[PDB]
Amino acid sequence: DSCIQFTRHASDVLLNLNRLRSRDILTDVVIVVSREQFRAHKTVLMACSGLFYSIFTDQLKCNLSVINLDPEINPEGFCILLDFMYTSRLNLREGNIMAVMATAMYLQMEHVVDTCRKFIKASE
Amino acid sequence: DSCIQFTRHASDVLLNLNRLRSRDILTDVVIVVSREQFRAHKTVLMACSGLFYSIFTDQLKCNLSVINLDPEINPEGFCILLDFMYTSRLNLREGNIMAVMATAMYLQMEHVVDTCRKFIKASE
Amino acid sequence: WVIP
Amino acid sequence: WVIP
Ligand SMILES: O=C1Cc2cc(Nc3nc(Cl)ncc3Br)ccc2N1
Ligand SMILES: O=C1Cc2cc(Nc3nc(Cl)ncc3Br)ccc2N1
Ligand SMILES: [Cl-]
Ligand SMILES: [Cl-]
C-alpha cells in the first residue's frame, strides 16, 4: 500500500495498556500463582504468551475470570514476566534467571526463553 | 533499573492484537458510525484515542457494548483510523485526508491530526 | 512518521 | 535484546 507509519505508535499503545493495568482499568482476569494474585487484560496476555493464547481461545476457558497456574510456577518469575509483557523490559538477574526461564517456558514466551538460555550459557 | 529490552516486543504485541481483531476474538464493543458497525477491543481504542479513553473510564459507559458516534463522522475515515490503531499504518490519500483529519480531531488522536495538518499545508 |  |  501507500501507507505512512508512526514509528512510536506500538510503544505508545503498550505504555497506555500498562497505565490501564497500573490503575486496574478494564482488567478482566485474575492469574493465581500459589498465594499471589495478578490482575491483567486477557488480550495482552494472549498477545505475549502461547499458553494464554491457547487458554483464552478455548470456548469454555475464554469465559473464566480466574486462571490458576501450575503450583510449580514461582510468583516472582510470573511478576517479572507480566511486567515484561506490558513494558518490553525484562528484569533478568542471576538470582531470578532460573525461575524466569522456567516460567517463560511454561507460558510459551519464546524470545524470553532464548535470552535466558544465552545468559545462562555465558555464565557456565 | 538493570532491565534488558526486547526491541520488537511492542510491535509484536500490536500485530497479535490485530490478528485477534481480524478473527473477532475477545472484541467487547461495537462502534456504530451511521449504517456501519466496527468491532474492536475497548482497551486498544482507549490506548489510541482520547475520546475512547474518556468514554470507557466513565462508570456508566464502561459497561456499554455499543457506542454510537456523532452522525457527522464518516465511516471510511473511522475505518482508516481503526486500522491505524491496530497497525501504526495510516492510509492517508488526497481523497480521504479531510475525512481522516476530522475523524482524528473528534477521536482525539493528536499525532494523526498533526500529520494531516502537515500534508494539507504542503498541497496549498 | 516514515515510509514503511 | 538491548540495554534500554
Ligand atoms: O512466544 C510466543 C508468544 C505468542 C503469542 C501468541 N499470540 C497470538 N498468536 C497469534 Cl498467531 N495470533 C494471535 C495471538 Br494473541 C501465540 C503464540 C506465542 N508464542
Ligand atoms: O492523542 C491521544 C491518544 C490518547 C490516548 C489516551 N489513552 C490513555 N491515556 C492515558 Cl494518560 N492513560 C491511559 C490511556 Br488508555 C488518552 C489521550 C490520548 N490522546
Ligand atoms: Cl517473548
Ligand atoms: Cl495518534
Side-chain angles (χ1 to χ4, degrees), chain A residues 1-58 60-109 111-120 122-124, chain B residues 1-58 60-109 111-120 122-124, chain C, chain D:
Chain A
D1 218 297
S2 59
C3 287
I4 57 174
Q5 168 154 356
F6 189 70
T7 307
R8 295 292 292 162
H9 180 72
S11 184
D12 288 353
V13 165
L14 194 62
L15 181 65
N16 281 337
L17 292 172
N18 196 32
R19 284 171 175 158
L20 293 182
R21 186 176 59 123
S22 75
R23 304 168 63 209
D24 198 34
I25 297 164
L26 289 190
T27 54
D28 53 3
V29 73
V30 178
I31 306 307
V32 179
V33 191
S34 306
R35 283 192 191 267
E36 301 259 289
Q37 291 189 3
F38 302 87
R39 294 209 49 98
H41 301 95
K42 283 175 184 174
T43 56
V44 174
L45 300 179
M46 297 165 81
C48 299
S49 156
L51 186 70
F52 291 125
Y53 173 68
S54 294
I55 295 166
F56 303 117
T57 54
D58 176 86
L60 279 179
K61 297 184 192 78
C62 67
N63 296 135
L64 298 174
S65 60
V66 178
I67 300 297
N68 302 300
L69 301 196
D70 186 293
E72 208 81 66
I73 302 304
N74 176 256
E76 188 187 32
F78 185 77
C79 187
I80 287 160
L81 292 171
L82 184 59
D83 285 345
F84 170 72
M85 294 185 192
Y86 280 86
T87 67
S88 311
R89 299 158 61 89
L90 187 67
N91 181 26
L92 198 58
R93 302 176 65 86
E94 181 184 48
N96 72 29
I97 190 151
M98 298 310 283
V100 169
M101 187 171 73
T103 314
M105 287 168 69
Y106 171 76
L107 295 181
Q108 300 165 32
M109 294 175 76
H111 297 300
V112 175
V113 177
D114 183 61
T115 194
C116 286
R117 276 202 286 253
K118 288 180 186 214
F119 275 50
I120 290 158
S123 273
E124 78 189 23
Chain B
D1 218 297
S2 59
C3 287
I4 57 174
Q5 168 154 356
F6 189 70
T7 307
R8 295 292 292 162
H9 180 72
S11 184
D12 288 353
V13 165
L14 194 62
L15 181 65
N16 281 337
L17 292 172
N18 196 32
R19 284 171 175 158
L20 293 182
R21 186 176 59 123
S22 75
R23 304 168 63 209
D24 198 34
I25 297 164
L26 289 190
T27 54
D28 53 3
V29 73
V30 178
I31 306 307
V32 179
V33 191
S34 306
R35 283 192 191 267
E36 301 259 289
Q37 291 189 3
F38 302 87
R39 294 209 49 98
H41 301 95
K42 283 175 184 174
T43 56
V44 174
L45 300 179
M46 297 165 81
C48 299
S49 156
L51 186 70
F52 291 125
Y53 173 68
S54 294
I55 295 166
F56 303 117
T57 54
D58 176 86
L60 279 179
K61 297 184 192 78
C62 67
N63 296 135
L64 298 174
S65 60
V66 178
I67 300 297
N68 302 300
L69 301 196
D70 186 293
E72 208 81 66
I73 302 304
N74 176 256
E76 188 187 32
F78 185 77
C79 187
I80 287 160
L81 292 171
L82 184 59
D83 285 345
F84 170 72
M85 294 185 192
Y86 280 86
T87 67
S88 311
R89 299 158 61 89
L90 187 67
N91 181 26
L92 198 58
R93 302 176 65 86
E94 181 184 48
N96 72 29
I97 190 151
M98 298 310 283
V100 169
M101 187 171 73
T103 314
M105 287 168 69
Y106 171 76
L107 295 181
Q108 300 165 32
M109 294 175 76
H111 297 300
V112 175
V113 177
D114 183 61
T115 194
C116 286
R117 276 202 286 253
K118 288 180 186 214
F119 275 50
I120 290 158
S123 273
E124 78 189 23
Chain C
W1 295 87
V2 299
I3 301 305
Chain D
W1 295 87
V2 299
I3 301 305

